[PDB]
């Protein structure tokens, strides 16, 4: 709880979408809405390149486990597989009839899930780029998809207050957790072992649902999240902090051991929509929307 | 002559038999004392299958020795 600013990643000319760390913990990537995906370092923000070659905008960018291969969630309704070391359009792949927001890889790096706006949650191929499976899941745009540790489960969040756990092999619904309120559930993700799911709902309250039983355990209070879909993370290096972006020009970091207001960071000038945590070190990213266009590296 | 029979599980029976007794008498005594049926009492003496129609004064059986009862399974 002694995080201070070190550097500032600048160069993005629109609302900064998301920034994510490499799995080896050495390359914090970046992107924006100006069809420019930059490649930055981790400890000083060192420039490498800027990935483009598109036709329309870009929403999100995923990884590879060896920190080499990439994919872009572009906004021309296509799927472009990219690369860190080269920067080449490896596979140009269509498949959707609307835009795509969330996309992820299984830990064995052979499948592409893509929670889209035309609601066809697909499972793609990496080696050949062929369509493999199809899930008629939701009647809303899919906000978050995620795999577990081994890779046998797929989670899915929606707008009508539903979360469904999907099967990798067979591909049918297994568990549906129900909520009387229906806010747009923004960002769900598994626990770092694969036995709990942390849910983010739009009533300014986070919830930690136990997986197999089916009830929640503890919540969070005191944050502002009503309009947008703000991400969240976990912390395993130091304490049990929970890092999330903020709307009121802050950084939302608290603990379930605390469950109260114990630490807030400050300095932003627009809504921080995406944060990211470092696996081995105490490095916290924080990127805001169009009125800031900068990234604030926090460091213990 | 109180010889012993230890099975593979680790249980030893205490049979206070005579040195000139039969096999079906031992079967009836085990039916009285345990409830286990006598359809599996294949006793092993130095690796050799003891025949069911025998007595104890036939195989030159040493007193207070150890035999072994091995369970068998059949039934559909």
């Amino acid at each position: 709880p002694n995080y201070a600013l070190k550097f500032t990643l600048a160069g993005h000319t629109k609302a900064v979408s998301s920034v994510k760390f490499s799995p080896n913990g050495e390359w914090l990537a970046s992107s924006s809405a100006d069809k420019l995906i930059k490649i930055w370092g981790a400890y000083d923000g060192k420039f490498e390149k800027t990935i483009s070659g598109h036709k329309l905008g870009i929403s999100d960018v995923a990884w590879s486990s060896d920190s080499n291969l990439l994919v872009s969630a572009s906004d021309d309704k296509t799927l472009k597989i990219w690369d860190v070391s080269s920067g080449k359009c490896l596979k140009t792949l269509k498949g959707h009839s609307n835009y795509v927001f969330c996309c992820n890889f299984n830990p064995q790096s052979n499948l592409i899930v893509s929670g889209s706006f035309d609601e066809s949650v697909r499972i793609w191929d990496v080696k050949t780029g062929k369509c493999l499976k199809t899930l008629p899941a939701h009647s809303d745009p899919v906000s978050a998809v995620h795999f577990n540790r081994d890779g046998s489960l797929i989670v899915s969040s929606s707008y009508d207050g539903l979360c469904r756990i999907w099967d990798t092999a067979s591909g049918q619904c297994l568990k549906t957790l129900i909520d009387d309120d229906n806010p747009p559930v923004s960002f769900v993700k598994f626990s770092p072992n694969g036995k709990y799911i942390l849910a983010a709902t739009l009533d300014n309250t986070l919830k930690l649902w136990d997986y197999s039983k089916g009830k929640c355990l503890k919540t969070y209070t005191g944050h502002k999240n009503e309009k947008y879909c703000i991400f969240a993370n976990f912390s395993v290096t130091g304490g049990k902090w929970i890092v999330s972006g903020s709307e009121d020009n802050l950084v939302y970091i608290w603990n379930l051991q605390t469950k109260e207001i114990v630490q807030k960071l400050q300095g932003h000038t627009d809504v921080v929509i995406s944060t990211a945590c470092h696996p081995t070190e105490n490095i916290i990213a924080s990127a805001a929307l169009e009125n800031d266009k900068t990234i604030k590296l926090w460091k213990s | 002559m109180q010889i012993f029979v230890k099975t593979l599980t680790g249980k030893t029976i205490t049979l206070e038999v005579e040195p000139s007794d039969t096999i079906e008498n031992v079967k009836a005594k085990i039916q009285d004392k345990e409830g286990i049926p006598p359809d599996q009492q294949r006793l092993i003496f130095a690796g050799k299958q003891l025949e069911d129609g025998r007595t104890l004064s036939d195989y030159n059986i040493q007193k207070e020795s150890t035999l072994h009862l091995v369970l068998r399974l059949r039934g559909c």
Partner: protein
């Protein structure tokens, strides 16, 4: 559920598959091919994981190590190599007599490998250096011996082409227990293969009179040297007479599968009762090569003319995984619901 029933697809990806095996957890499948290629699939993702070129001549034997990071093979070229799943490089290679049957690690140590040559004696090796211990054979007349480690790793059972099973201690070569199999009336029969379970002491002997005998691993230790045990269970087919090719046990050592060398079928028995429970037919005119079994889940992987089939339970779904508040009944159910008609637990979330 239990033992499989339905055909459930195939893997027609790489031609000319020949042999197959699983690891301890059943997440990988190594298959040698007709030109020195070892293709590894996945069952967690149902996709090809890694393809490693081994040699130019085919592969007829494979074995996983205990950690799962090392493979070993025995090709036609008398090559026994400790491979890598990360890099994929040959390390050790030295020639044997030209037919080789089977290789197998020690079930606790990845240092001891038990190679069974065809026209020789069993040779127990080391992998810290190039030592080799030729195990003793009683008859020394036919030189057709198959052998394997037991479940824990304490003993090695050996069998000859005359029906004489020996028990050697795994490190000092102590011939302490033996028997000759009571085949019919007077004549003796051959021994084709010896396999061991995953839970317990039971094992099976595949003879040449087309009868499979299921023994117990403790009656041999009870009887000692030159004893006469009898089998717990004798399993055969008398309609088609069915000369068998390959056998193994189920997950917890409860069921037995036994592929056929004439008609491309798979027969499954119980061990406790001992009755036939299901026959799994297939393509009518093929030829069978290998049978596998997934160690915690009912999946059988049968290689026949390069085609691997997977019998996998035919998952058929329903409602109420979508709408948990609804119960899709079948016929009418009458009731009234109730007889009166109107905490700080901190659990580690990152514990693996």
């Amino acid at each position: 559920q239990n033992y499989p029933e339905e055909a459930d697809g195939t893997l027609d990806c790489i031609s000319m598959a020949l042999t197959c095996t699983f690891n301890r957890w059943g997440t990988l499948l190594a298959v040698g091919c007709n030109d020195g290629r070892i293709v590894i699939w996945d069952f967690l993702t149902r996709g090809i994981a890694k393809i490693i070129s081994a040699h130019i001549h085919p592969v007829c034997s494979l074995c996983w190590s205990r950690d799962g990071h090392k493979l070993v093979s025995a090709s036609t070229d008398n090559i026994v190599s400790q491979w890598d799943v990360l890099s994929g490089d040959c390390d050790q290679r030295f020639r044997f007599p030209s037919p080789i049957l089977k290789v197998q690690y020690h079930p606790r140590d990845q240092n001891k490998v038990l190679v069974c040559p065809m026209k020789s004696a069993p040779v127990m090796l080391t992998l810290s250096d190039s030592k080799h211990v030729v195990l003793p054979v009683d008859d020394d007349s036919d030189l057709n011996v198959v052998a394997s480690f037991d479940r824990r790793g304490e003993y090695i059972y050996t069998g000859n082409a005359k029906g004489k099973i020996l028990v050697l201690k795994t490190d000092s070569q102590d011939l302490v227990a033996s028997f000759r199999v009571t085949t019919g009336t007077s004549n003796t029969t051959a021994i084709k293969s010896i396999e061991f379970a995953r839970k317990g002491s039971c094992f099976l002997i595949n003879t040449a009179d087309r009868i499979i005998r299921v023994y117990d691993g403790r009656e041999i230790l009870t009887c000692g040297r030159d004893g006469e045990p009898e089998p717990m269970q004798k399993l055969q087919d008398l309609v088609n007479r069915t000369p068998w090719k390959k056998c193994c046990f189920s997950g917890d050592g409860e069921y037995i599968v036994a592929g056929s060398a004439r008609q491309h079928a798979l027969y499954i028995w119980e061990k406790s009762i001992g009755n036939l429970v299901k026959i799994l037919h297939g393509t009518r005119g093929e030829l069978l090569l290998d049978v596998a079994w997934h160690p915690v889940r009912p999946i059988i992987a049968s290689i026949s003319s390069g085609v691997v089939s997977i019998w996998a339970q035919n998952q058929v779904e329903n409602w109420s995984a979508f709408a948990p508040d609804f119960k899709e009944l079948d016929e009418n159910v009458e009731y009234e619901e109730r007889e009166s008609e109107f905490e700080d637990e901190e659990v580690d979330v990152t514990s693996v």
